[PDB]
Amino acid sequence: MPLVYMNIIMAFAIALAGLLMYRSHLMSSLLCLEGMMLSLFIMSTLIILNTHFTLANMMPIILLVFAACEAALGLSLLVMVSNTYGTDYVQNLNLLQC
Amino acid sequence: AGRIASFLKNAWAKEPVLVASFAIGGLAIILPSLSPYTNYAIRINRATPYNYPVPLRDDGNMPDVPSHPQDPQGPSLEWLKNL
Amino acid sequence: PFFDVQKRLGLDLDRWMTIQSAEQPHKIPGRCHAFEKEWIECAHGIGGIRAEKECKIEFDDFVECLLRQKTMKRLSAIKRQRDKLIKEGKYTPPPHHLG
Amino acid sequence: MWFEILPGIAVMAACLFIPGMATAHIHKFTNGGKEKRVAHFSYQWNLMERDRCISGVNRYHVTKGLENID
Amino acid sequence: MTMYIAFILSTIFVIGFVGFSSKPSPIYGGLGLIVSGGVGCGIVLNFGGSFLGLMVFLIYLGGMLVVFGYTTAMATEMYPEVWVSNKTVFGAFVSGLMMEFCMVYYALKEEEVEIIFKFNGLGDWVIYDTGDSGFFSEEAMGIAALYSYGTWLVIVTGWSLLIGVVVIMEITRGN
Amino acid sequence: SMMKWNRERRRLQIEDFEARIALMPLFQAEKDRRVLQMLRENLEEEAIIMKDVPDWKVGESVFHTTRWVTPMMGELYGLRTNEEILSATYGFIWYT
Amino acid sequence: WKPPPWNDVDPPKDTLVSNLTLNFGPQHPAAHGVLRLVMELSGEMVRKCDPHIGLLHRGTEKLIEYKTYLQALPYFDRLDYVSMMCNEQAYSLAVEKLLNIQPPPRAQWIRVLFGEITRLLNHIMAVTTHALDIGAMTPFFWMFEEREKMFEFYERVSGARMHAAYIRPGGVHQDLPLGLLDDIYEFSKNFSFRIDELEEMLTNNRIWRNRTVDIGVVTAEDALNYGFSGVMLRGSGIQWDLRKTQPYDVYDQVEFDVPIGSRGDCYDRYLCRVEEMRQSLRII
Amino acid sequence: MFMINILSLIIPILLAVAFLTLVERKVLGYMQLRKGPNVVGPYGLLQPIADALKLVTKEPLRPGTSSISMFIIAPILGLSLALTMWVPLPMPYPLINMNLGVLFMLAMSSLAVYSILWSGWASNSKYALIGALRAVAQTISYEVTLAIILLSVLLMNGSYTLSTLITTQEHIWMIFTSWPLAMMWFISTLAETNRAPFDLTEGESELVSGFNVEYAAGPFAMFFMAEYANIIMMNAFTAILFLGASHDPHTPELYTINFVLKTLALTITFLWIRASYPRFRYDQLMHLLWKSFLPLTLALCMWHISLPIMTASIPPQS
Amino acid sequence: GEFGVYLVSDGSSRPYRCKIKAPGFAHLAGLDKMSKGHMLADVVAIIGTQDIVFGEVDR
Amino acid sequence: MELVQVLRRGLQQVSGHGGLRGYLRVLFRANDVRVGTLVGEDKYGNKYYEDNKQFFGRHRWVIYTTEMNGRDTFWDVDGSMVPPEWHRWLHCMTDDP
Amino acid sequence: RGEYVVAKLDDLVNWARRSSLWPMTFGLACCAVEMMHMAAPRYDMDRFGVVFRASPRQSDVMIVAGTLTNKMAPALRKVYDQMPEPRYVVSMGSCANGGGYYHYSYSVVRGCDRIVPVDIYVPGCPPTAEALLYGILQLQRKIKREKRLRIWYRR
Amino acid sequence: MNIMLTLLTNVTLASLLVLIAFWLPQLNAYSEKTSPYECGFDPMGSARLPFSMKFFLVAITFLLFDLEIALLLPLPWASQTNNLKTMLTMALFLLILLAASLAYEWTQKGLEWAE
Ligand SMILES: COC1=C(OC)C(=O)C(C/C=C(\C)CC/C=C(\C)CC/C=C(/C)CC/C=C(/C)CC/C=C(\C)CC/C=C(\C)CC/C=C(\C)CC/C=C(\C)CC/C=C(\C)CCC=C(C)C)=C(C)C1=O
């Protein structure tokens, strides 16, 4: 388990940490969401290439197919929250507190 | 006939691109089943030796498997030369 | 599978990629083909409870082949001890490992 | 007239000709005349590596024919 | 120096990863992702995954383009932030750089890191395997079998993406 | 014209591959000797490099199985030169 | 913590539309150079177009008062940079009407001759600069070679290339230089081809029509009420042309066809301009 | 002998765009009955040098509302991307024999648009943001057709290797088997490089700038030299992909001469259409691709997946 | 258009008031009406057909 | 049949302009190479040529003198260096040199 | 010699300047129409290296063609101040020079000089497209006689 | 090696041209030469407020469609299989849904750009 595995695993942790610390931006939040996807794609690519799991080389592709699909969903949701509330800071949508 | 011919002619006037694209799109699906060279394409792909033809141990009673590459018995693909 | 429709309906949907020793394209074997082949042939129908205790060394060989955890650890010790020994000056690499 | 346009092409055509000629000649010069061997697959690279080891001078392009064995 | 570019490339991947995870302005976040995405493509290329490397390069670039194409569309701030700007982003940024630089120091000085899992520093060149690939690249034939061995995956992926266009319009339509 | 030429290219590739199959036995035959030679050289050097260690019995198979496992490239070239490492691991990938 | 809404809908928040507003000039090359065109847009579709003008408000109407009738003649050449004799013809007719005096028949014929040449001048630049702003830059240069040819006729008769100061109350300054009519005939002989050169690359051009067809469409009564005149009435079905309804000078003797438009959009009026270019040749 | 090779590519490339600006006006002028530059040197053979030297000595200035860092890096992005993209082009023998050369050029060409809006966004100008937002959706929508057109044509290749086009169209030009895809490929190349049926990226008539909004002597020179280099290649890529040429393995000079001639002829056509058509409005150029190019694009794709199968003409993978 | 002049004299040798009818004045006054709904890139097209020379509107 | 005549006509210009050295002189200082009959010479050194076959506008031209009134004009030709008597003929205002 | 080296270097820069003037069209009045005739193929302004270019950030010389009305006078100064400044201003026509016909009006400044420094003055009403070509040629001569490096070497 | 040397040379060449771009031409600047350009008269204050364009729907479908082209990219190597019937059926299947998604996107306003 060489150091490149450490780099991208520790990377995904900061993607997890980055997502879980929304400061003032939904768009920057979605950035960290797609950020997670890099490390998962990159680690998955390293795994099935190292192990010569040739039939499983499709798995990183199918990750990406369902990757941007969420990415489109996030921005489409971001379209209306910014459209009808003006901005994208995740603090002005607290009307559901009650 | 009258309903179909009027529709095709009208679409051929206003939106030539769509009636065009639907044509080649339509032909792209139905000829490949009809055309007889599809089996040749399978045979050409099958006949391509990417891997080694690993020898199989001769314990006798294998008349069809050749003992030498130049032997007559076995899969011969002279049809490729003719085709 | 929770509700195994693949077993009942008798078709394959994902039981072709779940393992490394399946029919890969153009018979390209995986790295640890033999190691997992023994492991699966070891614990087949024996149950997960019995598999985790009986087919244990086969899994350990297979898991090691996947990561080379101990083998790389062995190589790490060879290089480190060689480095300090060469640096101190006891012995020098033989000419075959120079060119 | 229109033929006055051609000097604009000529100084460009010669300039665009250089990369094609330079790369073609550099490969031949740096590989002893023969074209640079292309390895699109590991098997091609395996031949090249065996060529480097066999030649003795650690040059893949330096080739030994029948005279190496006897 | 060319000992093994895997760690160096993955380091820039993490530093670029640190960037947009610190919550900059969204446009600067795209740059922080792109450098990580570009060098991430470099990591996979170095490991033999030639097709997959350029694959994530092309898709992501288009993906993140519409990302920060959107940010300037309706998510822009009238006074945009920057890597320095607010102390929060400044604090979030510098925290990431000092963090990763601590782990790599913790990584390269004993080579027996045991955080969560085990991580021993011996060189990612080692895990490579000796063997030819015939006249075909293994990765290309693996992802080519999607149309022969993965007909089930094609159906679910195709249907989901088709539904993906339905939801996008349906969500964004409104009224 | 494309149909005929592509068929000819397929026939050429068959000839190319058939040529490859002919020399595979030699390349396989020599390479196994080189790999065994490299491992043997590593084992002798490992014995010399560790003789005063507490317990490093020469050449213990980490895998419990007695069959041969295709060796790591690391354990082959590990103590060899830097140029040997780069030309071996990132040789085909970097050859552009 | 206030109670949740009864219909599960909150009142709409503060309006968040900013509607980016800019000034489209006067530096903009396609804004005629003197437009401070400010527009309101719904993001990209314009809502109102407030054309701030006065960026070239030279006090012409006040300066005319202080000059004599002859002294005020050059001002009308400097109102419309392209309609030179047409501008002076209007002022000359006004001064002659007050004076109850008519010009000699030769002077009238020269007026309508150079009046139609002028109509070629404005139409040439109107269409070509329309192509320039649209994006087609090539027909600009071809027909502005001919504009130089007509500029020679302006200079050969009056002395200056653009501001002729030629048409004056009571006729014209001086007679035509000998041999000018031959050059006018020579130039007009090939101008039919040059018009076909212009119109062939745009009239049927798919890009051109899509850039003008069904754009800027005005109705009939809308154009009449808005004070629109000239082509804009002609381009939208209204059959009106002062050259036929209220003939001035000897316009009651020349025969020509007014190109009434049908759709009223940009493309129809541009066609009317091109046809008005061809029709002037018959009048010439 | 690799630094010499690289500098035997960079210098000829920058000199090719250098005098393309002269063969632009000298061709544009002659097509609009003008004469083009013929004063600076004989026949204008020194005008671009006079242009270039001025554009590296007249005062550059960052905008007061600029973002310095992104303002400076955008010219770096444009120029380096343009140069690095010529790398796998298979002039007889390609400089870098990439196994996936086609995918490489697609990826980096999709990156040359980050320069245009990073320049636009950092410039903090109303015309800058408009031009930046015009260009991005312009290129990516034109990119969907770019990817599929390349794939449909290359299905007869059997691989993405650029060198194999030499072998593929050895006897027959590729355009004779994929001319319908050739037409949309040429139009898309006109659109990715922003020439002038769709030069709306600059939008000089309606946006005065947008390629380089406040960009000055140096940075303006880059954003020009980074797109005129794309002009030469996108026709070199068209030439290599569709109009093949005879390539004797012993005398590559004949192929280089032929290859250069096709690029020169194609580049003239890029200049030729530039002065023969009006400007597409934004919705029109988007409508043309999303509503007329794409339906034909997918249909001809399905044709080219099936075509080798029905005719048993699957090309060799190697 | 319909270029015209409202010339007012007083019996002297100079005009008393020379109002200049501007064909483009009413034309440019209607630009907002014609630009209703059309995209901004069509604003150049609907002033190109306008034929507004800016020495007449401004006078 | 006409290309060979064109090259011969183009080759004749080098003999027309006093040899090759004169040809580059006109090319590098007058930007034209067309030859034409010498209609006259003025006192300041300007050489006036005319060629009626050229279309109206280029049928007459002047090659400016190298030096006039203590100011070198080899590379510094000015449009006002024409004497009034020749200015009339040059501007096509009349046909009488 | 150092002076000789600075002499040739100055000439190289001055040649690069005078051989590429990019006017930023301030087309205001009938003076602009005649200037476009200079761009017309009859005189072909482009052939002299001088080609029309918008975006004053990418232009070298101003060509004031037409009357300068007091309302737009701030615009003239603003577009003048935004030029990367090896920069020159050419005034076309009597109106731009000193007011011309509208010298006595209430809303026309008596000359473009009062707003911007003015290089070569082009007289006319309008100056013929050939006269402007002579004017631009005069500016090229003025750029030729610039001793920027010689002055720096002798500071 | 070869690829990174080429990448390095390009960025150094580009950066050097910037360095001589901003340093060789000396500067005599002020606060009015750095003012944002707005075709003359003063800007009203913009270029960073939300500038909402209309092609957002088709901008995001490009991202969806760009994933389709990723899925159908491996086709050149997919033809080199022994079961082209299944490969042909699946290859056309992805194209059909890609066409179907565009067609349904077309019918419901879709490609039309909001006013
Ligand atoms: C609407 O539509 C529109 C368009 O179109 C659609 C348009 O077109 C246009 C454009 C307008 C026109 C065409 C109209 C006319 C205008 C013009 C012609 C403008 C002209 C503009 C120019 C930029 C001029 C271009 C002309 C020329 C002659 C350019 C010439 C080039 C050069 C002088 C430079 C050439 C390159 C050189 C010298 C490179 C030198 C390199 C080296 C010495 C080596 C460098 C590298 C190394 C040393 C590597 C080794 C180093 C190492 C390793 C360092 C390591 C370091 C470490 C720290 C490790 C517009 C505006 C438009 O509106």
Ligand code: SF4
């Ligand atoms: S000087 Fe004469 S031509 Fe020029 S703008 Fe003034 S009135 Fe018009």
